[PDB]
């Protein structure tokens, strides 16, 4: 029986990988809660004992033939095990590669842009360089904080990234992938039925096809953003060219959410802001997460565990704990789920208190799956569960029943645009930047972009795709793409493009089971146990089924659709046309601010 030899091999794995990765994740938790020299050595030794167990069991899994296995449950577990382990890199280069990844994270985290007039005061990005880039409107002040981050963290990361694209390329060729970009397009890889089949190169065909349909909505959005920002920047914006890349939202221009004080459709209407409302009421950091539990439990999803509140670091601790506090939803294993996030009470953290609580109730859902099938259906499925809760909670009808909004806040025809334009800056405003950052790196790892033409084709794709132009000329001595957190710390960035397409494809599927009669942006799936049983049916499979089958049984479509995204903004896309009649819809590549 070839099945039972591989059945008991996984039972040998699942009864030993569960304890070895739980001590690996507890040592990872201790590094991420208080950084010390005694915590890093406990982290990597447990992290290499689990890595030694990662590669030893992978070699034993390759002795099993997938053709003689006629059970799809254990074939998929063997497929992960046979195709993850034993890199082709030598002992010297693996220490070289781990030195680089620990240097690019150290340069990005400990890097700081000091003022050229006085280098004594110097912002280490937290706090600093985001209140400046998120609230200030001066052209000559944001130019310092943007170019300075491309200078201190740019020149110190370009030689580390030029060796990063070689060692990781050679590491990816050890698994017989062609490049490192093809190593990242394996969460979307699907083998199975011929109709429900998704190749690694069909992702590049589909994502380019989707952006050809986003761009009618984005260019009308980009024209209205440029017209409204022309009043705030009367001298440094051409009325028909590209926007400056440093005046948009965040520092890198990822989200446009900080432009809503400037680009506002109706300034005479009251805001939908919840930041001032929470501070005026009895609302602590527990009720940031306690009220978010009430939304998930209203639709039939289970409560948080009793050990969730005791073990998670929901707030920044005192007593001088040096903690990197990037918001991450930890699944430590053995039924233990935690959140590591230092919350600051605003509108942004209230939605990421559902995003990080969106990985939870997904990690809680596939706990009945085997250990290797305990991820999302892809990497875009995992990030879209939290953000589809950012569409039903952020509605003014749900905030009125929450009590955080005033009962006299009438939903006029002008407040249907103020909420919808704020959802266009966060969600539609990040789609071109997320696409080309995973189109620049997919060509850098392939070899379509040579190393002497990195920054040349980086900005040539910023102008053509996103519609942004550099305020200062950049040669090849700078590395602007590696200034982001997800690029310097070796993270896949195609999650945030594909989850957005799934953010509204899930949403329009949930609002037809919840029997919502009206527009898509007015939908609210709260207090509906029928729109949570179909969601939990999607969540409980994990990675057991291909994501083209999980999507087909949930939204009744096989491939990625952008029609649900366009129908969400169809009340806005009609309003964006009548405001862009006088202005020009488009951008010119040849214009330069300098």
């Amino acid at each position: 029986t070839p099945e039972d030899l591989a059945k008991t091999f996984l039972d040998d794995f699942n009864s030993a990988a569960e304890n070895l990765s739980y001590q690996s994740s507890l040592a990872s938790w201790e590094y991420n809660t208080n950084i010390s020299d005694e915590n890093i050595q406990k982290m990597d030794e447990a992290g290499a004992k689990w890595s030694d167990f990662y590669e030893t069991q992978s070699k034993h899994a390759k002795n099993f033939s997938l053709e003689e296995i006629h059970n799809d449950t254990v074939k998929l577990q063997l497929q992960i095990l046979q195709q993850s382990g034993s890199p082709v890199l030598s002992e010297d280069k693996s220490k070289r590669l781990n030195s680089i990844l620990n240097a690019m994270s150290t340069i990005y985290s400990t890097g700081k842009v000091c003022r050229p007039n006085n280098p004594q005061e110097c912002l280490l990005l937290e706090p600093g360089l985001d209140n400046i880039m998120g609230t200030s409107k001066d052209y000559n002040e944001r130019l310092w904080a943007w170019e300075g981050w491309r200078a201190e963290v740019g020149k110190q990361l370009r030689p580390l990234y030029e060796e990063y694209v070689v060692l990781k390329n050679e590491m990816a060729r050890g698994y017989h992938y062609e490049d490192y970009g093809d190593y990242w397009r394996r969460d979307y890889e699907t083998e199975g039925s011929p109709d429900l089949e998704y190749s690694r190169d069909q992702l590049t065909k589909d994502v380019e096809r989707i952006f050809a349909e986003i761009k009618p909505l984005y260019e009308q959005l980009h024209a209205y953003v440029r017209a409204k920002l022309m009043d705030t920047y009367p001298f440094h914006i051409s009325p028909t060219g590209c926007l400056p890349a440093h005046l948009l939202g965040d520092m890198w221009g990822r989200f446009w959410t900080n432009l809503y004080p400037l680009t506002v459709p109706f300034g005479q209407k009251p805001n939908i802001d919840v930041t001032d409302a929470m501070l005026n009421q009895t609302w602590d950091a527990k009720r940031i997460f306690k009220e978010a539990e009430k939304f998930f439990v209203s639709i039939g999803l289970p409560h948080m565990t009793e050990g969730f509140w005791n073990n998670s670091m929901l707030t920044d601790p005192g007593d001088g704990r040096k903690v990197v506090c990037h918001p991450t939803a930890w699944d430590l294993g053995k039924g233990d789920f935690r959140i590591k996030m230092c919350t600051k009470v605003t509108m942004e953290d209230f939605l990421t208190a559902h995003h990080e609580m969106g990985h939870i109730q997904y990690d809680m859902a596939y706990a009945s799956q085997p250990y290797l099938l305990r991820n999302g259906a892809n990497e875009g499925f995992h990030e879209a569960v939290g953000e589809v809760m950012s569409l039903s909670v952020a509605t003014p009808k749900h905030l009125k029943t929450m009590g955080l909004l005033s009962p006299d806040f009438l939903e006029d025809n002008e407040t249907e645009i103020n909420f919808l334009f704020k959802q266009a800056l966060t969600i539609v405003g990040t789609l071109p930047f997320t696409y080309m950052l995973e189109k620049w790196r997919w060509m850098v790892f392939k070899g379509e972009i040579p190393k002497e033409e990195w920054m040349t084709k980086w900005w040539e794709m910023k102008r053509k795709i996103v519609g942004v132009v550099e305020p200062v000329p950049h040669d090849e001595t700078y590395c602007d793409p590696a200034s982001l957190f997800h690029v310097a710390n070796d993270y896949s960035f195609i999650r945030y493009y594909t989850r957005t397409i799934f953010e509204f494809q899930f949403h329009e599927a949930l609002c037809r089971i919840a029997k919502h009669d009206g527009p898509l942006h007015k939908c609210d799936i709260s207090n509906s146990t029928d729109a949570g049983k179909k969601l939990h049916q999607m969540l409980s499979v994990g990675k057991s089924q291909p994501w083209t089958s999980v999507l087909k049984d949930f939204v009744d479509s096989k491939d990625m659709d952008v029609g649900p995204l366009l129908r969400y903004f169809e009340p806005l896309y009609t309003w964006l046309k009548e405001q862009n009649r006088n202005s020009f819809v488009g951008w010119n590549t040849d214009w330069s601010p300098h």
Binding site: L5, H60, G307, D336
Partner: protein, 184 residues
């Protein structure tokens, strides 16, 4: 005298699943009234064959008590006609099992940094009703027997529970003690 349930319910140290300890209790009188309303601590008080409140009037001879520690979601496998890992390799109860399987959470006490609880997880056969497999620390082969860990198809049976106090519910130590009320 009274019934020695202090050494069963309130013992200092409980064993693991495979090496469970059997205590034969006979000719005793017990106060089942205070054990009937002890639901503030006992997470599981399922009974089979007899009512929970009617067994005090009935006189039982040679009452057995099999006490051990399993994880939180392994208390479902201490039921008659139940299939699973520890219901077939560690501790199997017959279909005519009469009595009350009693379990309660012990995450504070039985989940320290020095304790170690194991389960069988690998055996060539089905465990008989009320059969205690001895502490056989010998490597299980997929076919026949093996010698060392490096041989293919050769896995060690006794996989330990990762009992830390920070694990979630279901993977927390539950002290399970059955009361096989044999009659006549």
């Amino acid at each position: 005298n009274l019934c020695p349930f202090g050494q069963v319910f309130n013992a200092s140290n409980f064993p693991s699943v495979y090496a469970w300890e059997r205590l034969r209790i006979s000719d005793c009188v017990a106060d089942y009234a205070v054990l009937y309303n002890s639901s503030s601590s006992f997470s599981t008080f399922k009974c089979y064959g007899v009512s929970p409140t009617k067994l005090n009037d009935l006189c039982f001879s040679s009452v057995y008590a099999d006490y051990f520690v399993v994880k939180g979601d392994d208390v479902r496998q201490i039921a008659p006609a139940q299939t699973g890992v520890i219901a077939d390799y560690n501790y199997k109860l017959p279909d005519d099992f009469t009595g009350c399987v009693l379990a309660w959470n012990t995450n504070s006490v039985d989940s320290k940094s020095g304790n170690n609880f194991y389960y069988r997880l690998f055996r060539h056969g089905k465990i008989k009703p009320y059969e205690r497999d001895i502490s056989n620390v010998l490597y299980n082969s997929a076919g026949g027997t093996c010698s060392s860990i490096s041989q293919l198809g050769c896995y060690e049976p006794l996989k330990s529970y990762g009992f830390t106090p920070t694990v979630g519910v279901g993977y927390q130590p539950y002290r399970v003690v059955v009361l096989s009320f044999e009659l006549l």
